Amino acid sequence: GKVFGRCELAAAMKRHGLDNYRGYSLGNWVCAAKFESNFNTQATNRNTDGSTDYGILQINSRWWCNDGRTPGSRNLCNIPCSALLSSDITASVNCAKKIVSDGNGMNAWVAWRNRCKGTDVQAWIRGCRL
């Protein structure tokens, strides 16, 4: 398994191009992970619509990844949901980029809305070596 720290995740997200991606500074992305999964790469939350949210960014199996159990599957990231539970974040960042570029920005992440949107998100990467 793996549970990230905030600066460790900030660095990884920056390496893969998330700082300012589609208008969202890096702290938004770290914040989203913090409140979606508490940085736990294997976080999984099974919902009452039959979909499941997977991994550090809690990516949902209706539109974005395939778990073979979800009604209405679009698999827009063309990715097995299993890949989004990996210890390294590449597949989640790849898919997150497509999310943010093809729905409603970071509104896709309800924890981003609830705990990050409009806050001092720079705090999440403050002091991190980037």
Residue numbers in the entry: 0 to 129
What sentences appear in the manuscript?
In the case of hen egg-white lysozyme (HEWL), recombinant production in Escherichia coli is problematic because the reductive environment of the bacterial cytosol prevents the correct formation of the four disulfide bridges, resulting in the formation of inclusion bodies.
The main differences between H-HEWLEC and the two other HEWL variants are observed in the Thr47–Gly49 and Lys97–Gly104 regions, both of which are at the protein surface and engage in crystal contacts. Interestingly, the refined occupancies of both Glu7 and Lys97–Gly104 in conformation B are similar (51% and 46%, respectively). These observations indicate that the displacement of the Lys97–Gly104 loop associated with the Asn103 peptide flip is linked to the disruption of the Asp101 Oδ2–Glu7 Oɛ2 hydrogen bond and the shift of the Glu7 side chain to conformation B. In the case of H-HEWLEC, where there is a greater displacement of the Lys97–Gly104 loop and where the Asp101 Oδ2–Glu7 Oɛ2 hydrogen bond is completely disrupted, the Glu7 side chain is found to fully occupy conformation B. Additionally, displacement of the water-molecule arrangements can be observed in the active site and binding cleft of the enzyme. It is also interesting to note the absence of a nitrate ion in the H-HEWLEC binding cleft which is present in the other triclinic HEWL variants.
